[PDB]
Write a protein that binds this ligand. Structure first.
Ligand SMILES: Nc1nc2c(ncn2[C@@H]2O[C@H](COP(=O)(O)OP(=O)(O)NP(=O)(O)O)[C@@H](O)[C@H]2O)c(=O)[nH]1
Ligand SMILES: [Mg+2]
Lengths: 63, 168
């Protein structure tokens, strides 16, 4: 399906479904972000978490 | 306080360069590969003419399977970059559809828009400039030729759209 996520500076991005770092890898570099310096979220989850788990729920990301 | 916010939307076909144009504008590097964008929103603070401007930009998806919610992306933006590839006749013919969808959702014959002929770094263009000129003349909007790889007219295109919004 699809899951939308927010970015800094009132920016955001939507990606489809695996490793949440591998699912959001290309978009993070596209939007300008290294996945080591940042992590998902108002409750943070692990970077190796399955991406298809939080389908339908929207998360945020900060450094 | 002395800063104005411009919400910009980029629409077009699937393989024209809506992302390459936007990515070249923000990070000053051309993406040779092709990862089709679903929906992306970026922001960049620039100085156009005299004032400092904050630009909210929306990279839509050309695919109609994801462009079902195209009414939402259009219902918020205040300016539109309509992009076709000068080596894609179909993308140029599809500009008519987008302008109607824009002129419908906004209910206006005058909307801040700019016609952009992308991929002008290639040869053997299937769409001549004079054709894209006449279409923009019919809509009452300007036409600018760009190349995301060459960075040719990439700034001119976006800044002219902001001026088209600011001069509304
Ligand atoms: N030579 C050349 N190639 C370009 C140019 N702009 C984009 N391309 C190439 O053509 C393709 C277009 O990719 P992209 O930028 O995602 O276009 P898009 O319209 O945003 N695709 P979508 O909206 O479906 O995500 C890519 O393979 C890209 O490398 C350009 O100005 N010149
Ligand atoms: Mg794209």
């Amino acid at each position: 399906n699809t899951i939308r996520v927010l970015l800094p500076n009132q920016e955001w991005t939507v990606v489809k479904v695996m490793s949440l770092h591998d699912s959001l890898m290309k978009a993070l570099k596209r939007h300008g972000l290294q996945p080591e310096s940042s992590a998902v979220f108002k409750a943070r989850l692990d970077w190796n978490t399955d991406a298809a788990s939080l389908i339908g729920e929207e998360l945020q990301v900060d450094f | 306080d002395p800063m104005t916010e411009y919400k910009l939307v980029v629409v077009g076909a699937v393989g024209v360069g809506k992302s390459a144009l936007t990515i070249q504008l923000i990070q000053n590097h051309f993406v040779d590969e092709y990862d089709p964008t679903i929906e992306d929103s970026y922001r960049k603070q620039v100085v156009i003419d005299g004032e400092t401007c904050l630009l909210d930009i929306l990279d839509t998806a050309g695919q109609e399977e994801y462009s079902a919610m195209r009414d939402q992306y259009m219902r918020t933006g205040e300016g539109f970059l309509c992009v076709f590839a000068i080596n894609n006749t179909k993308s140029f013919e599809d500009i008519h559809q987008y302008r109607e969808q824009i002129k419908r959702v906004k209910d206006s014959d005058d909307v801040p828009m700019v016609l952009v002929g992308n991929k002008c770094d290639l040869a053997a263009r299937t769409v001549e400039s004079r054709q894209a000129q006449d279409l923009a003349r019919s809509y009452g909007i300007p036409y600018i030729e760009t190349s995301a790889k060459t960075r040719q007219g990439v700034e001119d295109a976006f800044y002219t759209l902001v001026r088209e919004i600011r001069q509304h």
